Amino acid sequence: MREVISIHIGQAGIQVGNACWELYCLEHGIQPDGQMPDDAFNTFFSETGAGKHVPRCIFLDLEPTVVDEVRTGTYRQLFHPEQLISGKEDAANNFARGHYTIGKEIVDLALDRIRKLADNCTGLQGFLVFNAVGGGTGSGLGSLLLERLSVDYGKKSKLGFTVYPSPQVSTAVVEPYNSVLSTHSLLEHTDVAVMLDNEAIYDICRRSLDIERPTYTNLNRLIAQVISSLTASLRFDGALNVDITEFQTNLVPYPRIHFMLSSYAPIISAEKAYHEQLSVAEITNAAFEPASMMVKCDPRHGKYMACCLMYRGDVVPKDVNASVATIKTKRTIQFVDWCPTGFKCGINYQPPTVVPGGDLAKVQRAVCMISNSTAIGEIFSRLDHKFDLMYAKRAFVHWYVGEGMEEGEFSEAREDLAALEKDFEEVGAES
Amino acid sequence: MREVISIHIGQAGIQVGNACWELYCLEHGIQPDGQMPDDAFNTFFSETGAGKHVPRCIFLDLEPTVVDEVRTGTYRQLFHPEQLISGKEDAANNFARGHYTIGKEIVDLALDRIRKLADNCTGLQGFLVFNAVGGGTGSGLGSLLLERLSVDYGKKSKLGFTVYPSPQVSTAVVEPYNSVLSTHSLLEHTDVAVMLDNEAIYDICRRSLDIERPTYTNLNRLIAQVISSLTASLRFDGALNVDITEFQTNLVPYPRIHFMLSSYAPIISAEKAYHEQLSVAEITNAAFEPASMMVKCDPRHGKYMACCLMYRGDVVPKDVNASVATIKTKRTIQFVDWCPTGFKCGINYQPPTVVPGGDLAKVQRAVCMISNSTAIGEIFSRLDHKFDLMYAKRAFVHWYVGEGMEEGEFSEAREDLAALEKDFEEVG
Amino acid sequence: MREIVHIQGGQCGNQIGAKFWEVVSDEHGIDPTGTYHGDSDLQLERINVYFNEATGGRYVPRAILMDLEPGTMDSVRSGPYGQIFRPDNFVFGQTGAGNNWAKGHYTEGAELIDSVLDVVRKEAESCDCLQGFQVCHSLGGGTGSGMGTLLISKIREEYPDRMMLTFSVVPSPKVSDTVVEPYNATLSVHQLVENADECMVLDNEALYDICFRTLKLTTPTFGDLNHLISAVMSGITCCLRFPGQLNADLRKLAVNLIPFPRLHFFMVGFTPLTSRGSQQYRALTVPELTQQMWDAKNMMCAADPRHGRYLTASALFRGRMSTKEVDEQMLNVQNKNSSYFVEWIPNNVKSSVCDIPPKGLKMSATFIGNSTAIQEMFKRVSEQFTAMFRRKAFLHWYTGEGMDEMEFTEAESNMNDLVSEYQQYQDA
Amino acid sequence: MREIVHIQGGQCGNQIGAKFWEVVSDEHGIDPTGTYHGDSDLQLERINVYFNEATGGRYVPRAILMDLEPGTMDSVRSGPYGQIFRPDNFVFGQTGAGNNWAKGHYTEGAELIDSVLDVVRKEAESCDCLQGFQVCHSLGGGTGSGMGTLLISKIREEYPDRMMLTFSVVPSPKVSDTVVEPYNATLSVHQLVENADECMVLDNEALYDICFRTLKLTTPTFGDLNHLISAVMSGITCCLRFPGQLNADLRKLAVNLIPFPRLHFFMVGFTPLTSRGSQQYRALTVPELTQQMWDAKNMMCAADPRHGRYLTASALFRGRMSTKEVDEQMLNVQNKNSSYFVEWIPNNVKSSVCDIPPKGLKMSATFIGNSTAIQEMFKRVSEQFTAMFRRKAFLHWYTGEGMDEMEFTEAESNMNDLVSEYQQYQDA
Amino acid sequence: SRSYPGEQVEHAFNSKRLKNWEVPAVDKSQAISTSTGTRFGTLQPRSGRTQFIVDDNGHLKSGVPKLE
Ligand SMILES: Nc1nc2c(ncn2[C@@H]2O[C@H](COP(=O)(O)OP(=O)(O)OP(=O)(O)O)[C@@H](O)[C@H]2O)c(=O)[nH]1
Ligand SMILES: Nc1nc2c(ncn2[C@@H]2O[C@H](COP(=O)(O)OP(=O)(O)OP(=O)(O)O)[C@@H](O)[C@H]2O)c(=O)[nH]1
Ligand SMILES: Nc1nc2c(ncn2[C@@H]2O[C@H](COP(=O)(O)OP(=O)(O)O)[C@@H](O)[C@H]2O)c(=O)[nH]1
Ligand SMILES: Nc1nc2c(ncn2[C@@H]2O[C@H](COP(=O)(O)OP(=O)(O)O)[C@@H](O)[C@H]2O)c(=O)[nH]1
Ligand SMILES: [Mg+2]
Ligand SMILES: [Mg+2]
């Protein structure tokens, strides 16, 4: 009855889906060969006639080079091969290729597969969309998929975890274009968006886990931990259960402002765990610490508008309340005036799980804080300034105009982003 | 519950931090590997959910060459690795680099450690600052760190056990400069500041302990004996329990005068203990002895504005009041008129502890004296002479003005000493 | 005779009802198997006020569990006492609530009423003499608040003569468990002013106070707070379930309580509450019960009665005791601190008593107060509403269900008139 | 009947409160478990003046411990008789005291009063006939001098008719336990003059001499001093607790002593006090008791009777004796050294007697006297206060708490009015 | 965000007892109009018609005096 659908688009989408599913199988005792040696797996899986638990996910991409690694790996008995969707040619880091030229041939089969996947569902909670803004496939194809999903379902709730184009560390040069294009396209259709940045998670892995050379898999382990914490209350008991609609309602104040930060605590090494105590007050202080933000935004350049917290393990509601009251009394935390309230808290009795050969440490308390602050104006300003600096000269524009676009799409997107940053300015201004 | 926070800055701060934190781990049976084979260790530690006791201190410095030794020394399992803070390069005996260039990008990194180190305290008494006035990290980062504390805490009690440039013995040429700049920066920000010179403790090692091969690890062992004798009431029972809040109140007459002297008695070898009896009257007599002062200042040239006594061991209160009465009958000791009182006292039923391999002797009576004498205007004046002596040619200044300082901060910091000098005479 | 039908709406209600039926069932000595295993014939006489006979001597409760997203019901359906309920008294919708008063009241709630009402009637007629309804709420979320009130207005018109209680748990002043809390609160209050006969208000925060200020607990869980709420809820129907030399039906408790049809908000408190160490010192007599209950700490709501005046009050003592002490004690209070009681009501307390104390005690009490300090809940909620409704924040979620705007102001004006009624009658 | 509540506020307060409750417990034969193990019914007849019954037959003291920084409270709980106090009757704040009158009376007193009074009321209702209050202060410290007076002001407003008594330990003439003793003295005496009905002044100096010369003790610990004070405190309520052929309530004691509402600073002494050697030589007779009690050495305060004039005096005897001898001895004394007594009072002594001596003794006597030699302490104190206040030493500490200088001048004038009042009736 | 006085439970909610010695932020409690002006006073009533000053998407609609 408590069922969700997961969509991993682009390369980073499936790169993090692999981690999420290695997490879920291990957490629920599911062997890699589908079956295990109720109501606990039914959130992510489906039971066939005998024992087999096939996951209710979809891996969508345009490069065969990664879906075939998945098909040949140990996690090949899991998926219905019709879920792993690949294309002959890729989008080549081009929003126009991803949106107008290539993705419109496989949207039909992606949608009918989503239909067949949601048919067996009894009570559908919402769509998780793991996307990576900055690469043509990810950006354009997710925009197209979200428009189709909004016209099909509409009433359903879409969370989008979008690996966002980073300030300085960047493996691309054209991404300031497709980031603006993807935002202007999906803004009207996603129900909530969680931003997170490779630089911020690199800094976290550096300062906390003492790892100095993370090969894109530690970041995925961290994202898997985050989603497990976020969706615990769907498949695990505990006081103050919280689901997707409760999550989005008390967090998205206006139709425009739906982008939000993220954090996690504690996040430590197997020795600092053994040599620390990690009480709930320390955990919440570390969560609200700026240096724990999974995105490259400094919340002290703004004011919070709401926060959501999901405590796990040995946590008591009085301690949660006392720590939230201490945070309120603190002086370095600001709040926009029109929210005297501001915290949606939930508890789960299930501590966070650890993976064999992982890098985190076994703990008994953990917090995944998710706040909607008016400081992401700074990242929107960064992205707009970069798009500006480039489009002042019509750089790279011939690719986008040859692959089935025209010029007006750049102006629409830039004016939408200007309006969005003016929103983030005004709705925070106080009388 | 009766908790404090101990900060160590610079090489001296860390070189004493090894001494004190070797003492407490010994004073509470704490093995160097954290655990041991309540309300006692809770003053300086944090019993984690299983066994281990982490100290609530922070070693801050810029040269990696000292903090790595602690990371390889026997006391490496103790410290939370994030508490031991160390940079790439140091301030290089320069007040500016510790105040404008390097210090500005590590204070907030220390503050986040201090922030999380103040929340786990359920009842906080105050911060303990160990400083090295005369260097770059101690004098530069220290002063910059205190101002960041004064805006963050304000009313809390911050003590300063600041080692000070000795008159004759000196291992620096620019140390008159970064000392002046230190005071004017800490003057308005520390609550009370104890003083002590490396030479004054050298003679103590010569006359009393009779060690003719003294090193710094022979001095830092003498400072830990002071604080262990000063924070016994925080963690040990005993009559006339006395905390830190009641310590600055009845000791600092004006918001300016908070430079004080220190002493200790007895200080004897292992064998002369078998030649003595160490009555409580004899101790407090030798406590007021100028030769037993930990600063090269002469009290018999000035008057006492207050005194503070911490007794320890087999002491009963009648003799403290009996012998102090005698000292007030003696005439070598003076008191400024407007304080007919002046003797805050304290007792503890826990005698001082001896360290294996140390040089003190097992005893059962001890006294740690802290006084605010007006004769501390003499050690103050020389610093105003040597500063004024070199500043006339403005030697060595092209270094300070090369790292983000201007001429203002020199005359600014020079007048305050003049203003403080007359303050040490207006009270007479 | 005197049967009672019981509702549990929302996540909170579905979890307070867990402990409630665990408390009452043990009070009548029935197992989670539903079979009676008590000793006295007293349990069997008034067992039918809550349960119904079944084949084989089982006793199923007269409860109704309704909730969107039945996930929380899967918990209680799996607990120790989850095997007693009839499976047809489990109403739920496949979708979720969303902490949104609108869809919990207009869209989704409406699709369940057609089923819920068939449930309430089929077990309202099995009662040979229906006394009243009672519900358990939470004014924060959507299911408890939204579906709760929508259920009431259907009940208020179908059975207008019967009595409807609401043990509604209201929001907390200093920490809000939801952000949309003030919107959901008033829109529910605007229903309880007109469609409720009695409404006990509770606060999770004041429950924490009693939990570690009086009980001195260490790790309070919601399972322990519900062991408190279930203690006062069970404390009401004692006169219905057990004999007593001065009984007090549920209806006569209201007429003696509310002077005007709008002031149906009360505040409750339980007595005695001691630690595991205090039961060794404190004695259990009527003068003890009467001071802990009259104190301004056992008030389970976060409203200080000393900032207002008592209109009326009540008390439901349990245990064979002297019915004079109860009479002269509640008299002595009104005379001593006469500043807190109104004048145009000479004797403003009602006192009942039951010969049957709780299962494990010898004397106990229960308190109900109708004070004018209850307006403090309404001032604090009124501002938190206007601070964000004047800005039109979080509001597009409510108009999404076709809700109007005057439904917000009318819901608010109705409050800001109720806050004045509580002040006319408070002549200070 | 005639119940009494006991308050100890401060370090010295809480520590002498331990000995006082140990002396009384041994009087009525109760073990630290709380059970009763005496023999006579006299122990059980008037136990209710100090204790409250418990389940299983325990007797808990009617005491309140209020003090910041509960360190000394953790000690007295670890003591032998720490198992008897209700854990509820402890009031403590996590902050420090400061040895400062301001923050004791203004800042942290302000938050503790909310809970101290609720504790006071909840136990003052347990009394069927409240006789009065008694407190143990120490005018040097910060908690006692600050919290104590704030408590007494509140107590006097809530219960003005009753009798509040004080055993205040005043500063010492030559030695000074703290440095701001004058400020703590006057600011407290200014509060005592309006809000006290009886205030016996004790001084540690006088306690030391009695313990040194008379008792011949070699290591007089504060445990012994408080064993002295605990003896003289118990010696007052003997008429209340035990029968007597001429009993004397607490109220009639004041009525006879203080001729004027402002001369309530008494002077005490206990008899007999002998060494282990002289217990064999000297006898136990009423002439012996009165000869030692009238002496100028048993005066537990450092005031010299031979310099002033006795306004009134009182004696309380314990032991089956002849009541003609006491009347004869007191008359004989007045006629002999007649100059030390005022002439416009014909017979200025009262004399009680109790048929019940201390536990191990056979005849005992206790003395109280209202002399004019008490003005000397206030002259010495007022002199030290004006000396420091003329220069404003340590004043920034007091003014940092929202205090002004009128609160010092008011205090000093009120102490100057008191010393002139004492001078008038001292006609030399 | 503001802190409204929880009257009977207002003790044990200072910063101190919550292990916070960092110069508490009091403006969140002082913006309110409590009777005594402090944490322990009760606040004031209103008429409660609650006008709007803003259109659907934030963006204060009229010339409302606002801080830029
Ligand atoms: N956290 C994380 N980020 C990744 C990972 N792999 C790629 N990224 C980032 O995703 C962005 C590129 O997205 P891609 O999916 O590779 O590009 P695309 O959407 O497939 O478009 P085409 O390359 O044209 O097919 C880059 O900024 C990467 O840094 C990963 O494994 N983990
Ligand atoms: N009591 C004591 N004093 C020391 C010790 N080591 C150095 N000092 C003195 O401290 C002063 C300088 O010490 P440093 O800590 O190196 O100065 P700094 O603050 O680190 O400045 P930089 O060296 O430029 O980094 C000198 O006067 C030393 O005599 C020690 O171990 N014990
Ligand atoms: N005494 C008690 N109160 C609870 C409990 N769970 C939630 N509450 C309160 O219920 C409020 C949230 O309302 P909720 O029941 O989750 O939404 P609903 O499903 O629409 O009724 C919050 O203010 C919680 O504090 C519980 O287990 N015990
Ligand atoms: N009889 C007795 N008097 C004491 C004792 N300890 C302290 N006093 C006196 O208490 C005075 C200071 O007050 P104190 O209670 O210690 O500090 P406070 O906490 O601020 O009240 C000093 O003058 C001490 O002489 C003791 O143990 N026994
Ligand atoms: Mg790609
Ligand atoms: Mg150095």
Numbering used by the authors:
A (entry chain k): 1 to 37, 46 to 439
B (entry chain M): 1 to 37, 46 to 436
C (entry chain O), D (entry chain I): 1 to 428
E (entry chain H): 2 to 69
Study text:
The inner junction (IJ), which bridges the inner gap between the B-tubule and A-tubule is formed by non-tubulin proteins. PACRG and FAP20 are arranged in an alternating pattern to form the IJ linking the PF A1 of A-tubule and PF B10 of the B-tubule. Our results suggest that the IJ is made up of a complex of proteins involving PACRG, FAP20, FAP52, FAP276, FAP106 and FAP126.
Using focused refinement, the IJ complex of Chlamydomonas was improved to 3.6 Å resolution. At 3.6 Å resolution, we were able to segment, trace and de novo model PACRG, FAP20 and FAP52 in Chlamydomonas. Thus, the IJ complex is made up of two copies of PACRG and FAP20, one copy of FAP52 and FAP276 and one copy of Tether density 1 and 2 per 16 nm. PACRG has an alpha solenoid architecture coupled with a long unstructured N-terminal region. FAP20 has a beta jelly roll architecture, which consists of mainly β-sheets with a small α-helix. FAP20 is sandwiched by the tubulin dimer from PF B10 and the α-tubulin from PF A1. FAP52 consists of eight WD40 repeats forming two seven-bladed beta-propellers. The two beta-propellers form a V-shape that docks onto PF B9 and B10. In this work, we show that the acetylated K40 loop binds to FAP52 and forms a fully structured loop. FAP276 itself forms different contacts with tubulin with both of its N- and C-termini, thus it provides strong anchorage for FAP52 to the tubulin lattice.
